[PDB]
Each structure stands twice: as C-alpha cells, then as structure tokens.
Amino acid sequence: DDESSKPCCDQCACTKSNPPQCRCSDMRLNSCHSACKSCICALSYPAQCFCVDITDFCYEPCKPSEDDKEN
C-alpha cells in the first residue's frame, strides 16, 4: 500500500568497475528519502542535496502514476 516510498531514479550513471558500480538520482533540489544511507544535504533555500549511495542495477525512473507528466 505504501508505493510512495518505493525507491526510484532520475539521472542514472555507472562507473567502470567489475562488477560495475552504479549511483543514481545524483542531485536533488530538496532532499532524499529512505533509500540513501549516505546522503548529504544542505539545509538552505533553494535546498541542496546529494546521494552517494550506490547499487548494481540503477533503480527505475521516477514519476510514478501514468507515463510522462510535464513534457
């Protein structure tokens, strides 16, 4: 029922490694969620944040619900 916490992604990227490394949702103009143990955040306005946590599959794009939304 809590599909709002489901981890997602936006800007995905992988580093040359073996296995390859992969961090995503690099920057955030607000804050993170419950999928970044090592998240950095600057309590300011406009707020600033980052997620250095890494995975091996790069989560899937965000913006649940239908498909696109803005464009």
Short mmCIF file of C-alpha atoms in Angstrom, two decimals:
data_model
loop_
_atom_site.label_atom_id
_atom_site.label_comp_id
_atom_site.label_asym_id
_atom_site.label_seq_id
_atom_site.Cartn_x
_atom_site.Cartn_y
_atom_site.Cartn_z
CA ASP A 1 0.00 0.00 0.00
CA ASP A 2 2.97 2.29 0.56
CA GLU A 3 4.01 2.75 -3.06
CA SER A 4 5.13 6.29 -2.28
CA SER A 5 8.33 5.14 -0.60
CA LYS A 6 9.29 2.80 -3.40
CA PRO A 7 12.87 3.84 -4.38
CA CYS A 8 13.14 5.33 -7.86
CA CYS A 9 15.56 7.13 -10.11
CA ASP A 10 16.18 10.06 -12.42
CA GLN A 11 19.75 10.63 -13.54
CA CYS A 12 21.39 7.23 -13.60
CA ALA A 13 25.12 6.63 -14.10
CA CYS A 14 27.63 3.77 -13.79
CA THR A 15 31.35 3.74 -13.09
CA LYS A 16 33.82 1.48 -14.87
CA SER A 17 34.34 -1.39 -12.43
CA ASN A 18 33.95 -5.16 -12.04
CA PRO A 19 31.14 -5.62 -11.31
CA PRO A 20 30.27 -2.09 -12.49
CA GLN A 21 29.22 0.46 -9.88
CA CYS A 22 26.03 2.48 -10.20
CA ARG A 23 24.72 5.54 -8.47
CA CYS A 24 21.61 7.42 -9.48
CA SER A 25 19.44 10.39 -8.60
CA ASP A 26 22.73 12.17 -8.28
CA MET A 27 21.43 15.61 -7.29
CA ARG A 28 18.19 16.67 -5.66
CA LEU A 29 16.80 20.20 -5.30
CA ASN A 30 15.28 19.31 -1.96
CA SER A 31 16.17 16.19 -0.01
CA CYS A 32 16.39 12.40 -0.22
CA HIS A 33 14.17 9.60 1.03
CA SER A 34 14.59 6.15 2.64
CA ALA A 35 16.99 4.75 0.01
CA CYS A 36 20.18 6.65 0.73
CA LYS A 37 22.13 5.84 3.83
CA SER A 38 24.90 8.20 2.86
CA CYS A 39 23.00 11.29 1.71
CA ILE A 40 24.43 14.76 2.04
CA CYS A 41 22.13 17.76 2.49
CA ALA A 42 22.48 21.47 2.81
CA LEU A 43 19.56 22.91 4.76
CA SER A 44 19.12 26.06 2.72
CA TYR A 45 16.82 27.72 0.22
CA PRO A 46 16.81 26.59 -2.53
CA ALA A 47 17.76 23.45 -0.60
CA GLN A 48 20.57 21.26 -1.92
CA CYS A 49 21.20 17.53 -1.56
CA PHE A 50 23.11 14.56 -2.88
CA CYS A 51 23.09 10.75 -2.68
CA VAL A 52 26.41 8.91 -2.83
CA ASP A 53 24.88 5.54 -2.04
CA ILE A 54 25.47 3.01 -4.83
CA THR A 55 23.78 -0.06 -6.22
CA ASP A 56 24.44 -2.60 -9.01
CA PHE A 57 21.35 -2.15 -11.17
CA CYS A 58 20.30 1.50 -11.16
CA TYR A 59 16.72 1.78 -9.96
CA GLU A 60 13.98 2.65 -12.47
CA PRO A 61 12.96 6.21 -13.49
CA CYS A 62 10.66 8.04 -11.11
CA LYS A 63 7.42 9.91 -11.55
CA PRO A 64 5.02 7.01 -10.88
CA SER A 65 1.38 7.08 -11.94
CA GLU A 66 0.81 7.36 -15.67
CA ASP A 67 3.75 7.84 -18.02
CA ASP A 68 5.26 11.30 -18.51
CA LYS A 69 3.81 14.27 -16.65
CA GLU A 70 5.32 17.63 -17.57
CA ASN A 71 6.54 17.44 -21.16
#
